[PDB]
Amino acid sequence: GPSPNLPPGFDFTDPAIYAERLPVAEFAELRSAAPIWWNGQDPGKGGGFHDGGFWAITKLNDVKEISRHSDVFSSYENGVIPRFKNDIAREDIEVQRFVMLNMDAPHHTRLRKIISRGFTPRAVGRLHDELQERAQKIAAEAAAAGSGDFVEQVSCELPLQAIAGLLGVPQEDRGKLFHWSNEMTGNEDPEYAHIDPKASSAELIGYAMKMAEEKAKNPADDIVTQLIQADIDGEKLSDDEFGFFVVMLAVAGNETTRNSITQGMMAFAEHPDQWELYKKVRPETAADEIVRWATPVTAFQRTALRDYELSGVQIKKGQRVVMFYRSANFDEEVFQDPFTFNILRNPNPHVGFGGTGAHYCIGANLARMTINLIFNAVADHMPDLKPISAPERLRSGWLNGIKHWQVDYTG
Ligand code: HEM
Numbered sequence: 001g002p003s004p005n006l007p008p009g010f011d012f013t014d015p016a017i018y019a020e021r022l023p024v025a026e027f028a029e030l031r032s033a034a035p036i037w038w039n040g041q042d043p044g045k046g047g048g049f050h051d052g053g054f055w056a057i058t059k060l061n062d063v064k065e066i067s068r069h070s071d072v073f074s075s076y077e078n079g080v081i082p083r084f085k086n087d088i089a090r091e092d093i094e095v096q097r098f099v100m101l102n103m104d105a106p107h108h109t110r111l112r113k114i115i116s117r118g119f120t121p122r123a124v125g126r127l128h129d130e131l132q133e134r135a136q137k138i139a140a141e142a143a144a145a146g147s148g149d150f151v152e153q154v155s156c157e158l159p160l161q162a163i164a165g166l167l168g169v170p171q172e173d174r175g176k177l178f179h180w181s182n183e184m185t186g187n188e189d190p191e192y193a194h195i196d197p198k199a200s201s202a203e204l205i206g207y208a209m210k211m212a213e214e215k216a217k218n219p220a221d222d223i224v225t226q227l228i229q230a231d232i233d234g235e236k237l238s239d240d241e242f243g244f245f246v247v248m249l250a251v252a253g254n255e256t257t258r259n260s261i262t263q264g265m266m267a268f269a270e271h272p273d274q275w276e277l278y279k280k281v282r283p284e285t286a287a288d289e290i291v292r293w294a295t296p297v298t299a300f301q302r303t304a305l306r307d308y309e310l311s312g313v314q315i316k317k318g319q320r321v322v323m324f325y326r327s328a329n330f331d332e333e334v335f336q337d338p339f340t341f342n343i344l345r346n347p348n349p350h351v352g353f354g355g356t357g358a359h360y361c362i363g364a365n366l367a368r369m370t371i372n373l374i375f376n377a378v379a380d381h382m383p384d385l386k387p388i389s390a391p392e393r394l395r396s397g398w399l400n401g402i403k404h405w406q407v408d409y410t411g
């Protein structure tokens with residue numbers, strides 16, 4: 001059929017778009033007119049990739065199919081982040097292969113089994129009561145300030161405390177853990193231009209290796225002991241593997257949940273009836289509708305290891321496919337009224353945590369718990385909050401971020 005009605009050279013990974021808005025109409029145009037579409041990229045404008053473009057994947061069933069066929073659609077070959085600075089050196093993409101998100105089977109399989117021996121429902125539930133306390137204190141301190149930046153005073157801290165609690169980081173070390181975690185989220189936005197994620201990653205690995213050595217001597221009620229203790233087959237994270245796991249957790253556990261919280265509250269501010277309902281019933285289905293609405297990871301990619309036909313389109317060996325979770329999470333064929341914010345939506349088969357498959361978010365239930373606990377505290381302590389001014393968005397080609405959002409907590 002006809003080509004989609006998009007500006008010439010439009011690139012769905014263009015960070016300049018996301019600094020200002022989400023390209024919702026443009027994704028909807030692809031879903032209607034070209035649901036798998038070649039996103040050409042001019043020379044040097046590939047965000048670190050120099051292959052002329054990628055396939056934009058906009059439908060939820062195609063996202064699931066790619067996520068399920070990890071034997072064809074590789075994470076390792078080019079990593080899963082689809083956009084860096086245009087001049088990033090290839091070696092700096094490939095160094096990301098040392099974290100489990102960017103590996104393939106069998107290396108991925110071994111690492112995930114280890115990381116899931118201690119990253120369990122029991123381990124996550126053991127954090128509930130401390131995170132609930134922490135959420136209530138966060139919302140109370142914010143309410144006591146009267147007004148301020150919702151991102152920094154409400155959204156930022158609880159995800160970081162969840163990472164610290166899961167790893168057993170002593171309170172005296174949490175400040176520098178949080179600092180490293182914030183540094184690692186990138187430097188593509190002018191506000192963050194001076195951050196050095198490479199150096200912070202190196203500092204975190206050093207910290208984590210020391211922790212691994214200490215905790216081997218003195219086991220404790222954290223997941224760490226389960227990770228570095230050999231099983232029957234002698235399987236365990238090496239000290240440097242634990243280091244790369246901590247890097248993985250420090251980055252993955254921070255900005256995505258933060259941005260869920262900020263955008264969830266933005267949604268409630270635009271849909272006051274859903275906010276009234278939330279405050280009365282406190283439904284935990286809210287968390288998934290908030291992750292669907294927020295889609296904190298706009299997109300992750302894969303690389304085809306062989307020719308593969310996907311929904312009538314021929315994907316060729318070596319081509320990238322980019323899974324636009326932001327489009328799939330609003331797919332009219334899967335969701336009833338996707339552009340309605342409905343905190344009781346159930347079932348809610350969103351792909352905010354990725355498609356079912358080998359790389360499905362191991363932190364999904366921790367994130368959901370974090371979200372439910374912070375929104376209960378917000379409802380308890382600042383039920384009448386109202387925004388002062390517009391959110392400031394983050395310049396990124398794949399993360400959907402809110403840097404700042406001024407709010408009057410007393411309303
Ligand atoms: C709302 C919050 C979050 C969102 C939107 C989110 C999103 C995602 C997505 C889309 C993936 C799929 C990776 C792929 O298929 O290439 C993923 C994987 C992953 N997430 Fe999350 N995530 C969240 C929170 C967390 C938290 C809190 C943690 C850890 C405490 C975490 C750790 C991980 C890890 C380690 C993986 C990689 C798993 C593997 O490669 O086997 N995430 N996440």
Ligand SMILES: c1cc(-c2ccc3c(ccn3CCN3CCNCC3)c2)ccn1
Binds near residue numbers: 101186187252255399
């Ligand atoms: C899964 C994954 C993530 C996730 C993974 C990586 C992530 C972030 C945020 C930043 N990075 C890394 C940034 N890249 C490019 C810029 N240079 C440094 C390296 C989140 C979250 C949840 N679940």
